[PDB]
Amino acid sequence: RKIIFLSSPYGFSQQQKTLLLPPIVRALEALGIEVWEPFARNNQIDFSQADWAYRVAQADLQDVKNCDGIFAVVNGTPPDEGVMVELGMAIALNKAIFLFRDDFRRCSDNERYPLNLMLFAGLPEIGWENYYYTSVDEIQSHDKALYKWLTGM
Amino acid sequence: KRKIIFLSSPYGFSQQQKTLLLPPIVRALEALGIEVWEPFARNNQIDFSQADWAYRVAQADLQDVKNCDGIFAVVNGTPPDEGVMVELGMAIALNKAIFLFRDDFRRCSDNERYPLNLMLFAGLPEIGWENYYYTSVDEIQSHDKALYKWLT
Amino acid sequence: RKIIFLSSPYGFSQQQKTLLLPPIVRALEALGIEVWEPFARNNQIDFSQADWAYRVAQADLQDVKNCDGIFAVVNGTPPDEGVMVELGMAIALNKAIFLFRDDFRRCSDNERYPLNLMLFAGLPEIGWENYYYTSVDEIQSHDKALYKWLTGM
Amino acid sequence: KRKIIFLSSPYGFSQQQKTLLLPPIVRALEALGIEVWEPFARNNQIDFSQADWAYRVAQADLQDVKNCDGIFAVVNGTPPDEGVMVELGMAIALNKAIFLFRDDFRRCSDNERYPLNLMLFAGLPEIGWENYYYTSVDEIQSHDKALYKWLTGM
Ligand SMILES: Nc1ncnc2c1ncn2[C@@H]1O[C@H](CO)C[C@H]1O
Ligand SMILES: Nc1ncnc2c1ncn2[C@@H]1O[C@H](CO)C[C@H]1O
Ligand SMILES: Nc1ncnc2c1ncn2[C@@H]1O[C@H](CO)C[C@H]1O
Ligand SMILES: Nc1ncnc2c1ncn2[C@@H]1O[C@H](CO)C[C@H]1O
């Protein structure tokens, strides 16, 4: 099975972590994907020791190296800095890239993209919108990049 | 052959910041004998009247991070700029040298170890990461900090 | 019946609108408060005409003038600029102030408060944290400011 | 007697920004004959060794906004700074004169009319709001913009 790293800032808010993440994980898993979600995958880190921050950093770094694609939740103004670092790692490692934003605000300096142009550096010049999801219900669309990627095209 | 530093900042988005904040930093770096690639300057030959300009700038910045020796990332703001963060993650994944700059005294973090989100330090060592972390322009040329030591 | 203006950024994201806001609305309503939620209250605006943005701004401004207190959701780094404007209006108009933040990141310019000191300018020097709620489940606590407000204590 | 501008900005948080970005804006406003109240400077005499300093600064800033004639809000960033936004909201509710400054060319808005969150413009008129919206330091001096009309009763 293809491995998706689900990069989001939803683990920082108790309510967001509980209500927002599980539905996205389920949509992904219904496509046959193995989902790596960093907040859940790090729940067994000894939050006691002071080095936990460095341990989590390295664990997330390895999960990106070892995933097949990244599903980056890029809601908010601006998108979360941890998601962006992990997205930049994904781009540089030639992983598949999928972006999610159901926030309807536009926040960018260019007409082409709704966000800072670097978020799109790992996507094609034409047809990048096919990798850009704007609702949870769209994740399972057979006409979007995630489905096509699983099934060849 | 000079070492090449990609100077990643959000300062080009503001007319005033572009004019007054970047030159002092570029000059401090050039003083060390570094070749500075500053993405806003490096893309001023682009035709910003064509809609494809955004993709061309993305690919330029992507290529310049690939081709640099290290990144000097201005990570001021709450949060740090998302373009800088993508470029920083690229630099980490490609084993470039990493240097961080924050002269913002606000602390904005999940953890007690680091003043920012822990991912920004994933490419720095567990011990002694502070030596790569600059908190004022006047500190950039310090011979006790990681950028000078890396050059030599 | 006391009127709370529930100020939040959650109407900008489809998922956050449907999943995060109703639970907070219900917790406030269970205390016996009349909740004014600006995204719901503006859904009968004619959004085809360009001036809709001005109409929403004035309707929001009036709701804050006419409420008794503000319940400001100040998750995020930084908190939402619209919420902050409205918080600022509430402070100047001597409305009662209640803050909600279940995001565990600390992001502040000072040792005393968990956020930018100006968010607390309308709270008392002593006991400001009694107005600062950290989980949805805490909203109904008999020991916090909303309840004291409703029982005159 | 000079009109009083409260110059609200996040530039005091960064050593370089405080040193290089604020004085040119202060000078621009003073060139119009305005008295400028810049909160990072006005609070330099607070005793920052006592933990209550944050409460004293908050109250001092709150009082300055009550006592000013208008606010000049530097609303650069994505998003604009939350302390600036609180003070802007105070100024709107207190019927102060409102002037916004953004030389950030990123557009970051919920709507097609305004370049930023619509609530920042709630204190400005429906028509001609852009006359109060400055996009460069050099434009502060413009006799066609709101600061100058304000000072000449036009
Ligand atoms: N405290 C934390 N726990 C787990 N992942 C974290 C984290 N802080 C940052 N990250 C990583 O960066 C992203 C959110 O900032 C997603 C996650 O992989
Ligand atoms: N319009 C632009 N011009 C140049 N670089 C840009 C840019 N938008 C984003 N970037 C890249 O991403 C970072 C700033 O967000 C630094 C820069 O290299
Ligand atoms: N459509 C809208 N645009 C901006 N702000 C809005 C809004 N509807 C409601 N608001 C109020 O303004 C703040 C959101 O930015 C909090 C919210 O209560
Ligand atoms: N010394 C200081 N430290 C932090 N915030 C300060 C400050 N002086 C003033 N403030 C207020 O903090 C707010 C941050 O934008 C606005 C500003 O008026």
Side-chain angles (χ1 to χ4, degrees), chain A residues 62-125:
Chain A
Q62 294 298 318
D63 282 356
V64 172
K65 290 161 89 191
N66 294 331
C67 78
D68 297 306
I70 186 174
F71 189 91
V73 173
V74 299
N75 286 329
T77 58
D80 177 88
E81 62 267 25
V83 178
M84 294 302 83
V85 170
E86 288 163 354
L87 171 63
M89 295 170 164
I91 293 173
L93 300 163
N94 308 291
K95 308 301 191 171
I97 308 303
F98 309 98
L99 301 177
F100 177 85
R101 183 174 169 97
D102 70 359
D103 184 336
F104 74 76
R105 301 168 294 174
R106 260 186 73 96
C107 191
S108 95
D109 72 341
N110 69 87
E111 328 83 277
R112 179 72 91 243
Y113 300 106
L115 299 171
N116 181 304
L117 54 87
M118 291 299 312
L119 278 75
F120 304 85
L123 296 173
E125 186 169 12

Side-chain angles (χ1 to χ4, degrees), chain C residues 40-53:
Chain C
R41 279 171 69 87
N42 281 287
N43 61 26
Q44 292 310 295
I45 277 275
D46 184 354
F47 294 105
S48 60
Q49 312 306 342
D51 72 338
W52 74 259

Side-chain angles (χ1 to χ4, degrees), chain C residues 28-44:
Chain C
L28 290 169
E29 276 170 349
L31 292 166
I33 291 149
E34 179 186 359
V35 176
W36 288 358
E37 198 280 303
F39 296 94
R41 279 171 69 87
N42 281 287
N43 61 26
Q44 292 310 295

Side-chain angles (χ1 to χ4, degrees), chain D residues 89-104:
Chain D
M90 295 167 169
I92 296 166
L94 297 171
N95 293 312
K96 307 296 190 174
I98 309 293
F99 312 92
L100 312 177
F101 176 86
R102 185 167 176 97
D103 66 358
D104 190 325

